[PDB]
Amino acid sequence: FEAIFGTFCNRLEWVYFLTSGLAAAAHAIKFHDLNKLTTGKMLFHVQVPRVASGAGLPTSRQTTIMVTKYSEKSPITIPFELSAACLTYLRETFEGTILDKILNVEAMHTVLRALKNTADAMERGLIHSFLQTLLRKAPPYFVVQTL
Amino acid sequence: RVASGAGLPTSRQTTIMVTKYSEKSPITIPFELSAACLTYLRETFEGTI
Amino acid sequence: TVSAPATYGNFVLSPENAVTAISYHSILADFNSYKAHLTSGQPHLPNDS
């Protein structure tokens, strides 16, 4: 005889955005009207101090500096596929035979694996998008040290 | 898998299946005994010292 | 000082393994466990044969 000693399956590791240390740079918020939002903004108002000047020299008038900051938008996406045979087995039972039961349970397990995989992919894609944002805004060492 | 941003192709599911096989390597060692050993093992001639 | 296994393990064949070796020249180890998990609808076995 020839023997099958075992059949193996990889156990996945699930990651979440909040569990990462990269989330420390984030202030994460849910907003159920986000699709209806045109980009949001923040307003700032600063009045600088000044020093009294000596005789003869011109004085400094008092300035107000008002600035604005804006937001960026960047959605993400991922698909999962199900076959028509998987769908028809998932929906309906033909006969009560053991094989048909196997096919029904197998379609259910196919769908469950696909949903779990997509959910993990969504968490990972959020992490990836935030890291890309950080790399997009971050200037290199020589610029910031010169500043 | 990792979700994709605008303009980049999203990655599809894959299932990868591999197999591994055993191997064989028998070993052999002999030992041999002389017919005198086989005689004296069983037979006690007259029982002297 | 290290704790190591004192004896070789024992790989044994179930009677369904015997029937399948006779009829098909093949072995599926833990055949009855595979059967029970397959019929109950449980997607994972507990451990390797």
From Swiss-Prot, chain A:
Homomultimer. Makes the hexons and eleven out of twelve pentons. Interacts with triplex proteins 1/TRX1 and 2/TRX2; adjacent capsomers are linked together in groups of three by triplexes, heterotrimeric complexes composed of one molecule of TRX1 and two molecules of TRX2. Interacts with scaffold protein; this interaction allows efficient MCP transport to the host nucleus. Interacts with capsid vertex component 2/CVC2. Interacts with the small capsomere-interacting protein/SCP. Self-assembles to form an icosahedral capsid with a T=16 symmetry, about 200 nm in diameter, and consisting of 150 hexons and 12 pentons (total of 162 capsomers). Hexons form the edges and faces of the capsid and are each composed of six MCP molecules. In contrast, one penton is found at each of the 12 vertices. Eleven of the pentons are MCP pentamers, while the last vertex is occupied by the portal complex. It comes from the Viruses. It is found in: Virion; Host nucleus. It comes from Human cytomegalovirus (strain AD169) (HHV-5). This is Major capsid protein. Belongs to the herpesviridae major capsid protein family.
Curated annotation (Swiss-Prot), chain B:
Belongs to the herpesviridae major capsid protein family. Homomultimer. Makes the hexons and eleven out of twelve pentons. Interacts with triplex proteins 1/TRX1 and 2/TRX2; adjacent capsomers are linked together in groups of three by triplexes, heterotrimeric complexes composed of one molecule of TRX1 and two molecules of TRX2. Interacts with scaffold protein; this interaction allows efficient MCP transport to the host nucleus. Interacts with capsid vertex component 2/CVC2. Interacts with the small capsomere-interacting protein/SCP. It comes from Human cytomegalovirus (strain AD169) (HHV-5). It is found in: Virion; Host nucleus. This is Major capsid protein. Self-assembles to form an icosahedral capsid with a T=16 symmetry, about 200 nm in diameter, and consisting of 150 hexons and 12 pentons (total of 162 capsomers). Hexons form the edges and faces of the capsid and are each composed of six MCP molecules. In contrast, one penton is found at each of the 12 vertices. Eleven of the pentons are MCP pentamers, while the last vertex is occupied by the portal complex.
